[PDB]
Design a protein around this ligand. Sequence first.
Ligand SMILES: CCCCCCCCCCCCCCCC(=O)N[C@@H](CO)C[C@@H](O)c1ccccc1
Length: 236
Amino acid sequence: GTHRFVQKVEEMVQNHMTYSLQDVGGDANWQLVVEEGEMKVYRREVEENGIVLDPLKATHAVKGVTGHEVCNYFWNVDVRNDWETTIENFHVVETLADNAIIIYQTHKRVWPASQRDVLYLSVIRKIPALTENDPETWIVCNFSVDHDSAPLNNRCVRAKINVAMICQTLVSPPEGNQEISRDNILCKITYVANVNPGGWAPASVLRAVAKREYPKFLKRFTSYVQEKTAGKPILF
Ligand SMILES: CCCCCCCCCCCCCCCC(=O)N[C@@H](CO)C[C@@H](O)c1ccccc1
């Protein structure tokens, strides 16, 4: 629409559609560090000046939910505290459009160092399929920005993020007179997180925290979407 971040939003969605959906399984610069069920979590080891930046990428397949649903739930701030366990406080700093907000939040200490806070634009978008033979893609991008009404917090260190949750609904209609049900749909999810913790910590500790907290978030967040949509009509 007409807001000042539409160009940046476009570039991010684009970067993510081209570079983030890419296959990471046989990629030797990624290591698969967590596997649970349909979930796989990868990281690539990266540091710049002693600071761990490790790109992370998780794939998941979740039964009975659509991509539209998973992204709605991921994006929607009124349900955040139902699933998010790492947040201390947050608030919407601005509304840019009906699908784009800027959020400030403070995180619980996940290592014994200063709390980190973050200031990011969170946008939800549908990428149209090219044919009706492919899935439409829903994506939430969360990436850092600056705002007059949210400068640096004396106590907290400022993390910078570039995150995306990308989902696609696979449908598999039954052969007979039955109506399509939640049994017939599967959500493919790619979640990517590139975080700059904003200062130093021992790499072993930050890496053990990523390994612990990302899979805990995915399991709990996806399970939550499954619970909140069970029995309801399907939103594609
Ligand atoms: C960014 C601050 C780093 C220090 C706090 C967290 C350190 C690793 C914990 C990772 C937390 C996993 C759950 C994240 C779920 C998650 O994606 N949460 C979003 C909504 O609260 C913001 C999000 O797009 C994000 C992603 C990564 C880090 C911060 C915020």
